[PDB]
Amino acid sequence: GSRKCEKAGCTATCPVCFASASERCAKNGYTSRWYHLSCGEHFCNECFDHYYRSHKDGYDKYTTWKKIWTSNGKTEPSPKAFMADQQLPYWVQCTKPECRKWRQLTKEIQLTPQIAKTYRCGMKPNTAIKPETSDHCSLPEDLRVLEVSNHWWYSMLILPPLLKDSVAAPLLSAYYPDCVGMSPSCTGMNRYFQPFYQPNECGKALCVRPDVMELDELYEFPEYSRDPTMYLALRNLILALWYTNCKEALTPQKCIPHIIVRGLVRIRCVQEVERILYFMTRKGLINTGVLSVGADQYLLPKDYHNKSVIIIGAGPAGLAAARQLHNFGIKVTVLEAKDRIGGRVWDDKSFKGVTVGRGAQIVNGCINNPVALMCEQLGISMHKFGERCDLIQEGGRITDPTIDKRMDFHFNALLDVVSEWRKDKTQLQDVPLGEKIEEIYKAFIKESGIQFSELEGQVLQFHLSNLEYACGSNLHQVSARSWDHNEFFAQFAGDHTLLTPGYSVIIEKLAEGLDIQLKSPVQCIDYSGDEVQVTTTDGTGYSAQKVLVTVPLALLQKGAIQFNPPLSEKKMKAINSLGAGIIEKIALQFPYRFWDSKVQGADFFGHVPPSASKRGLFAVFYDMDPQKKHSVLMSVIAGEAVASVRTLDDKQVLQQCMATLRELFKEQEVPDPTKYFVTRWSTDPWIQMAYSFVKTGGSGEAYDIIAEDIQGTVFFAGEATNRHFPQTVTGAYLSGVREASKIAAF
Amino acid sequence: DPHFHHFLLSQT
Amino acid sequence: ARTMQTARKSTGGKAPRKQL
Numbered sequence A: 001g002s003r004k005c006e007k008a009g010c011t012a013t014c015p016v017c018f019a020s021a022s023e024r025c026a027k028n029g030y031t032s033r034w035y036h037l038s039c040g041e042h043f044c045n046e047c048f049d050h051y052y053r054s055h056k057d058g059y060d061k062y063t064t065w066k067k068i069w070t071s072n073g074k075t076e077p078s079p080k081a082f083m084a085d086q087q088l089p090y091w092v093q094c095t096k097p098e099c100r101k102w103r104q105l106t107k108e109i110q111l112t113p114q115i116a117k118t119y120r121c122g123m124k125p126n127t128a129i130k131p132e133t134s135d136h137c138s139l140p141e142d143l144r145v146l147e148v149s150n151h152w153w154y155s156m157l158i159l160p161p162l163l164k165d166s167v168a169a170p171l172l173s174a175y176y177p178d179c180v181g182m183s184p185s186c187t188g189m190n191r192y193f194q195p196f197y198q199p200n201e202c203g204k205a206l207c208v209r210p211d212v213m214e215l216d217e218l219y220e221f222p223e224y225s226r227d228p229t230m231y232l233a234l235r236n237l238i239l240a241l242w243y244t245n246c247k248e249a250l251t252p253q254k255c256i257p258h259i260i261v262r263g264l265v266r267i268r269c270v271q272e273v274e275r276i277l278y279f280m281t282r283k284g285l286i287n288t289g290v291l292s293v294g295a296d297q298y299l300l301p302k303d304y305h306n307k308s309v310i311i312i313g314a315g316p317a318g319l320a321a322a323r324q325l326h327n328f329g330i331k332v333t334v335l336e337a338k339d340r341i342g343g344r345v346w347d348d349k350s351f352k353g354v355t356v357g358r359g360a361q362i363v364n365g366c367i368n369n370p371v372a373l374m375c376e377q378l379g380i381s382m383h384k385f386g387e388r389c390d391l392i393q394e395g396g397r398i399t400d401p402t403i404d405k406r407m408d409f410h411f412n413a414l415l416d417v418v419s420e421w422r423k424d425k426t427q428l429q430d431v432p433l434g435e436k437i438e439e440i441y442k443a444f445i446k447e448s449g450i451q452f453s454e455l456e457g458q459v460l461q462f463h464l465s466n467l468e469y470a471c472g473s474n475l476h477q478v479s480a481r482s483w484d485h486n487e488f489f490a491q492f493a494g495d496h497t498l499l500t501p502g503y504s505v506i507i508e509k510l511a512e513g514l515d516i517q518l519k520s521p522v523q524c525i526d527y528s529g530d531e532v533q534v535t536t537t538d539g540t541g542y543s544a545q546k547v548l549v550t551v552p553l554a555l556l557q558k559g560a561i562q563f564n565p566p567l568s569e570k571k572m573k574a575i576n577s578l579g580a581g582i583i584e585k586i587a588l589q590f591p592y593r594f595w596d597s598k599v600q601g602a603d604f605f606g607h608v609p610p611s612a613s614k615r616g617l618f619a620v621f622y623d624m625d626p627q628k629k630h631s632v633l634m635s636v637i638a639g640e641a642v643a644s645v646r647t648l649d650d651k652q653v654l655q656q657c658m659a660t661l662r663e664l665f666k667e668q669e670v671p672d673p674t675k676y677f678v679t680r681w682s683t684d685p686w687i688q689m690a691y692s693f694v695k696t697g698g699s700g701e702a703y704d705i706i707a708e709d710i711q712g713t714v715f716f717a718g719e720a721t722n723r724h725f726p727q728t729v730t731g732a733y734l735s736g737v738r739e740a741s742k743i744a745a746f
Numbered sequence B: 001d002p003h004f005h006h007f008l009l010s011q012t
Numbered sequence C: 001a002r003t004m005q006t007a008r009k010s011t012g013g014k015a016p017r018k019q020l
């Protein structure tokens, strides 16, 4: 006999049994012991025995469940665990907008998504009796509901909730379900969506542990750091639903019917799911990409809306941040120097049946790549590059396998020793990658003296040139220490693809509906007053509480924008420690596909260089039609070769490319090209570059330093502010998403 | 271990 | 950076593969 809960601090003054299993159930009365599940939920010792004791009628149900539990879950099976999983009644919320009260469902009703979707106060099964005229919504809500939102309610919930039939479950079978907030007694998505880490997996980009909270999740929800189970389950559920339907804004309304767990804790679960949703939204994990809203249904609570920002530059970073902030409900104006949007995304659509980027067009690693997500949203297909790239010599001969394999081995071995050499070196000891490679190569011929043929030397030149393409620089200017610094962080895994409709489709959709001022080069930014004043080159003024600069590295280096107060000497040192790399592209349309015989379907072919100085002159040719019907080749100018080309006119560059193509296909006539372009990014005044790299003496840390906001007022995005993902449209886009989150919080 | 962390959830 | 390479990716010089 007792009317008191076993649990010190429990706020229940009148414990009732929710089980009502035993014929001798204490109900609201006396029992030898009241078992505490939560502050609103207890069960009597008679019902405990009903399930727990061998001679009692519920022992069969308990032991059946217990065996299942023991071979699925990691957590000890208990009568409490049992009660919470199997016997605790369900709570559901009334669907009427003017009511919205929480109601307990009778002990035998199982909650389903459909019931949650449609429930109304006092809903009974079909009946032939005329319904009473009563109004069930005016019935008073159980007093225990109020208590759930108190911070202390959760601290007195004995066992964390465990979701049933979570959309996230299929993706997480490798884990103990209870360890990721899923019930151990349970049980056509885009192949580029792999949001959850798996056991023994290597690091991959934009991946979360389903069983561990990320740093920012700890920061935002410190009350779940000791007990992450409920948070994890909901976050995992939220990511599962977003990727399941990335074409719509994911809302608490659509998450609710998918939260299925017994007891008052379900109320707490749906309360939290809302906050976790907005957090994941602000951070750019969901409700992002090219999703639009459009026209008055913003993605963050009104609390965020009263604030204004100016974004400088309408490239991928600028538009990503602008898209996010606009979607949040924030006021956004964008100022762009040129007479078009896109920056280093600029597509030529004038070729027959094909789109050719003058700038970016490849996606490097589509797994969890926001470009892949955005293609999904737009219904865009991407062409996965095949592996084969034959090294064709002037003139005509395909480099033999054993020669190819051999020199590949040797080129990569030189990189191995660069890696060995740099291990304990400081910035002051850095040397150019090109110089270091030469140094090791020379000592290699010396120490072993294994002369390579002229051709073997040239094949090696092809690999060196491929590095110059990657860095946008002659190797003599790239840091041996830091050239591949980003690979410290998990990188984008899986396919490289050609973005067949071009990045401009994504660029255009991101910009759709935004206030963008073209031909408005910013000349000065003053963040001395109460808000920032930004002035264009013609004197036009704009003002906002915040400003985001996304202009290219080369323009920061030139100092084309005056900052008042000036940027720190530390920022400037970072800015000048990075290289503004450059490549250029040529694209060529022909009457017919003359390479088809020798190339045989490959997406690209390589060009063995005749000499070191020319190694960057069209090292690789790209077949710009995956369907293999049209006839367009693209190629790249890199390294020492871009300098060799700046005083040449388009016709000359074209003649050299044709000279090359004719050498590569000497076993035939090659038709003249009927259309072409040659890019001049190097001398485009507002761009002046292709992509950043680390100069000798420099550090990956420069990316972080450039990314550092100033006084929570001046923000920075762009490919040269992304340490994990430098250079790319994806890195630039992600840097904009990064900044929009920082700006929305401040 | 900073190698594995999600880029968007490690902005501290 | 090495991550920009598509055709003929280099492979040498990489830190020891990291697992969970």
Ligand SMILES: Cc1cc2nc3c(=O)[nH]c(=O)nc-3n(C[C@H](O)[C@H](O)[C@H](O)COP(=O)(O)OP(=O)(O)OC[C@H]3O[C@@H](n4cnc5c(N)ncnc54)[C@H](O)[C@@H]3O)c2cc1C
Binding pocket: A312, A313, A314, A315, A316, A317, A318, A335, A336, A337, A338, A341, A342, A343, A344, A345, A358, A359, A360, A361, A362, A363, A364, A520, A521, A522, A523, A550, A551, A552, A555, A560, A561, A583, A584, A585, A679, A681, A686, A687, A689, A690, A691, A717, A718, A719, A720, A727, A728, A729, A730, A732, A733
């Ligand atoms: C030839 C080439 C090939 C490439 N290939 C690829 C590839 O295959 N894959 C890949 O992912 N990436 C590729 N890129 C890289 C890529 O396109 C960039 O990394 C990406 O576009 C960067 O975006 P961003 O917003 O940081 O800068 P940007 O695209 O350069 O946008 C910057 C904007 O700021 C504007 N600006 C400058 N000054 C001002 C000012 N004072 N006021 C207002 N606006 C200003 C610019 O005009 C520009 O529109 C390639 C680039 C080049 C040039």
Ligand SMILES: [Zn+2]
Binding pocket: A017, A018, A019, A020, A021, A022, A024, A025, A026, A027, A043, A044, A045, A046, A047
């Ligand atoms: Zn009882």
Ligand SMILES: [Zn+2]
Binding pocket: A005, A006, A007, A010, A011, A012, A035, A036, A037, A038, A039, A042
């Ligand atoms: Zn109690």
Ligand SMILES: [Zn+2]
Binding pocket: A094, A095, A096, A099, A100, A101, A120, A121, A136, A137, A138
């Ligand atoms: Zn109601």
